[PDB]
Structure 1
Amino acid sequence: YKLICYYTSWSQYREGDGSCFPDAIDPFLCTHVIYSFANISNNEIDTWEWNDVTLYDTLNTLKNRNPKLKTLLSVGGWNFGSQRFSKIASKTQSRRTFIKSVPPFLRTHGFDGLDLAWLYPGWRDKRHLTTLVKEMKAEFVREAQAGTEQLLLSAAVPAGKIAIDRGYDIAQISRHLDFISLLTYDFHGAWRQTVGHHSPLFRGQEDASSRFSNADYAVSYMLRLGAPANKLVMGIPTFGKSYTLASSKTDVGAPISGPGIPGQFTKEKGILAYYEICDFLHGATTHRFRDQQVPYATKGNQWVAYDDQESVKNKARYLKNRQLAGAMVWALDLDDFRGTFCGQNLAFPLTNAIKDVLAGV
């Protein structure tokens, strides 16, 4: 199985214990570590944070301890305008300038591949994403001729049917990618005007939940569109999503006034790291969605959908049963990477839980 794990460069800036440098990463934890995100500047791949050349070195030096570990650099992300990516991909000359820039930058910095994280292509973009994947792969096949192991090429693909349909020609892009990480953890958000889970495995029955907004639908759809199971990696979050309640109701369809209050460390309304969630659960009421197979918790006027050891283990069992290529984790710096918050004295509890199941029958 693959265990694809994202590291985010902006985690460095979180205060105190929240602060995450790549030497926090267990070199034998994941099969692949993906550093997020690279810029595109002057129509070439480029660094984003001021100290990225040092952080890339600190990540890549993990390979002296686990020579089999693979690293990738993810280009794009949500602070990169989809429109910016569209302009580069849609023109022959800019596309080529970008593609030619990628192997030398990855080699200089010690990366084994590129992850494409265009978030996300519009309807007019779908044909250009296809060309970009094809031509990037062709360039990596050519660069391999000079004697180094061929660069890997992956992509991060949203799991909502509507975004898949708009932006992605899954049958074609899957031919050229080494793996696709399916982003099966964005199925609910404050835009809705109720509580709900963002990473359910299956639909809620009871009495209100749409049939596409779950991981099983998205996996099945990707496979039906032509993505081979041996290229499909299912995303599992280590973060949870928070809401502010509009009433005393906390169950299904409970109204919300907006995102939850920021976490002490992550400092973003609507999202909490798992280490923050472990702390939140002190004094909280916990519940599970029985059909969806994922938990939530509530204290005061705050309501949190999250994943725990049990839920990620159950997701890992699913993807094994479906003969998928493995799991992706978003993100290492959102798991309890210190191992001190969740009462287990265990670094990376959720990632380790996943790995424990992938290393079983």
Structure 2
Amino acid sequence: YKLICYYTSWSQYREGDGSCFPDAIDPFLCTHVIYSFANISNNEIDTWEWNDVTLYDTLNTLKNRNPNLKTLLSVGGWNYGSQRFSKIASKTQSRRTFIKSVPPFLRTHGFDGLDLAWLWPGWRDKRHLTTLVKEMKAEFVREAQAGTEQLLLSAAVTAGKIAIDRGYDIAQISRHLDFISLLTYDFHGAWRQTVGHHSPLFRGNEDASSRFSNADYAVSYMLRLGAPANKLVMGIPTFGRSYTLASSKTDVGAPISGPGIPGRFTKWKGILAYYEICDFLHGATTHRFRDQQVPYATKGNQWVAYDDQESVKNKARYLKNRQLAGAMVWALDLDDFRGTFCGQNLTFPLTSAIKDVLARV
């Protein structure tokens, strides 16, 4: 079973104990560590941060400790225009340039493959995504002839039905792709004007309007679209999402003034790391959607949906049962990587729980 874990570049800037470098990653924790993100420039893959060449190095030296560790490099992310990606892919010449740029760069910096994070394609883009995957893989096949082990190619895929139908030929891309990481953590946002969970496993017959907005739909549906189970990797968030409440209503349907306040360390409105969440839980009221099998918490005018060790195990079992290739984690830097915030003296609580479960019968 794969354990695909994402590291974010920009986690290096958070103050104090928030600062995460590739240093902190235990090299027997994951099977694949993916480095986000790379920039494209003159139609060629490129660094993003000023010191990625160093952080690249620091991550790829972990393979000294675990010779079996596979590392990849992710291109795009949200930071970065779909507009821009589309422009590069829809022309045969920029596409080619970008594809040829990729292996030499990967090799130079010691990566084992590429993750495409095009977030996300439009309906006009679906045709070019397929071609790009196809052609990129053919390139990885042709470079394998040179005696180095064949590069891996993977893709980050949105778990929302509307988005999958708009932007992805799943059946086709599944052939050329080594695995697909399904982003089953986005099933809600602050654009809905109430409370709700964003990673729920099941719809939970609290009240389908979306019966589509849950991990299980997303998984059935990708299999139904023809993603082999053995290429499919279910995404499990390590962060939580916060919402400022608009009243003392707190259950399902409770209205929302907007996103919750910034976390002390992550400093983004609407998001918290698990380590910031473990601290929030002190003096909060805890609840668990029975149906959807995920927890929330609330205190003051703050309401938080999150994943904890139990829900994360539970998702790990679900995917074993479903016979999928593994789990995908977003993200290491947002898990309790120092192991000091959540009571126990365990680092990467959330990710270890998955890993333990992935090793059971």
Instruction: Give the SS at the match of 1:219.
Output: helix
Q: Alpha-carbon deviation of 1:204?
A: 2.4
- Ranges in structure 1 where 5+ consecutive residues have no aligned partner: none
Q: Deviations over 1:132-185 (max 9, x none)?
A: 000000000000000000000000000000000000000000000000000000
Instruction: Give the SS at the match of 2:145.
Output: helix
CA distance in 1, matches of 2:206, 2:260: 24
Instruction: Give the SS at the match of 1:133.
Output: helix
CA distance in 1, matches of 2:153, 2:210: 33
Q: Alpha-carbon deviation of 1:209?
A: 4.8
Match of 2:327 in 1: 327
CA distance in 1, matches of 2:290, 2:214: 14
Instruction: Give the SS at the match of 1:250.
Output: coil
Q: Alpha-carbon deviation of 1:205?
A: 1.2
Instruction: Give the SS at the match of 2:128.
Output: helix
CA distance in 2, matches of 1:207, 1:129: 35
1:201-350 equivalence runs, <5 A: 201-207=201-207, 209-350=209-350
CA distance in 2, matches of 1:66, 1:359: 18
CA distance in 1, matches of 2:26, 2:267: 25
Question: Does the Cα contact within 8 Å between 1:203 and 1:209 map onto a contact in 2?
Answer: no
After TM superposition, where is structure 1 displaced by more than 4 Å over at least 4 residues in a row? none
Q: Alpha-carbon deviation of 1:121?
A: 0.1
CA distance in 2, matches of 1:235, 1:281: 24
TM-score, normalising length: structure 1: 1.00
Match of 1:2 in 2: 2
CA distance in 1, matches of 2:340, 2:129: 42
Q: Deviations over 1:237-269 (max 9, x none)?
A: 000000000000000010001000000000000
The change in CA–CA distance for 1:16 and 1:209 in structure 2 (over 3 A counts) is farther
Match of 1:80 in 2: 80
Q: Deviations over 1:315-334 (max 9, x none)?
A: 00000000000000000000
Which deviates further from its counterpart, 198-207 or 281-290? 198-207
TM-score, normalising length: structure 2: 1.00
Instruction: Give the SS at the match of 1:146.
Output: coil
Q: Deviations over 1:167-214 (max 9, x none)?
A: 000000000000000000000010100000000000021245520000
CA distance in 2, matches of 1:117, 1:87: 15
Question: Does the Cα contact within 8 Å between 1:43 and 1:94 map onto a contact in 2?
Answer: yes
Instruction: Give the SS at the match of 1:6.
Output: strand
CA distance in 2, matches of 1:37, 1:73: 7
Question: Does the Cα contact within 8 Å between 1:316 and 1:327 map onto a contact in 2?
Answer: yes
Q: Alpha-carbon deviation of 1:120?
A: 0.2
Q: Deviations over 1:282-307 (max 9, x none)?
A: 00000000000000000000000000
The change in CA–CA distance for 1:127 and 1:206 in structure 2 (over 3 A counts) is same
Question: Does the Cα contact within 8 Å between 1:312 and 1:350 map onto a contact in 2?
Answer: yes
CA distance in 1, matches of 2:86, 2:208: 37
CA distance in 2, matches of 1:271, 1:129: 30
Which deviates further from its counterpart, 200-209 or 292-301? 200-209
Q: Deviations over 1:100-119 (max 9, x none)?
A: 00000000000000000000
CA distance in 2, matches of 1:211, 1:166: 19
The change in CA–CA distance for 1:194 and 1:208 in structure 2 (over 3 A counts) is farther
CA distance in 2, matches of 1:17, 1:299: 24
CA distance in 1, matches of 2:201, 2:207: 17
Question: Does the Cα contact within 8 Å between 1:208 and 1:253 map onto a contact in 2?
Answer: no
Question: Does the Cα contact within 8 Å between 1:72 and 1:112 map onto a contact in 2?
Answer: yes
CA distance in 1, matches of 2:254, 2:60: 46
CA distance in 2, matches of 1:166, 1:338: 40
- Kindly indicate whether residue 180 of structure 2 is the aligned counterpart of residue 180 of structure 1: yes
Question: How many pairs are equivalent?
Answer: 361
CA distance in 1, matches of 2:223, 2:265: 38
Q: Deviations over 1:60-87 (max 9, x none)?
A: 0000000000000000000110000000
Q: Alpha-carbon deviation of 1:219?
A: 0.2
Q: Deviations over 1:21-56 (max 9, x none)?
A: 001000000000000000000000000000000000
CA distance in 2, matches of 1:276, 1:262: 10
Instruction: Give the SS at the match of 1:253.
Output: coil
Instruction: Give the SS at the match of 1:172.
Output: helix
Instruction: Give the SS at the match of 2:304.
Output: strand
Instruction: Give the SS at the match of 2:61.
Output: helix
CA distance in 2, matches of 1:101, 1:146: 16
- Ranges in structure 2 where 5+ consecutive residues have no aligned partner: none
CA distance in 2, matches of 1:276, 1:319: 27
Q: Deviations over 1:5-29 (max 9, x none)?
A: 0000000000000000001000000
CA distance in 1, matches of 2:169, 2:206: 34
Question: Does the Cα contact within 8 Å between 1:211 and 1:217 map onto a contact in 2?
Answer: yes
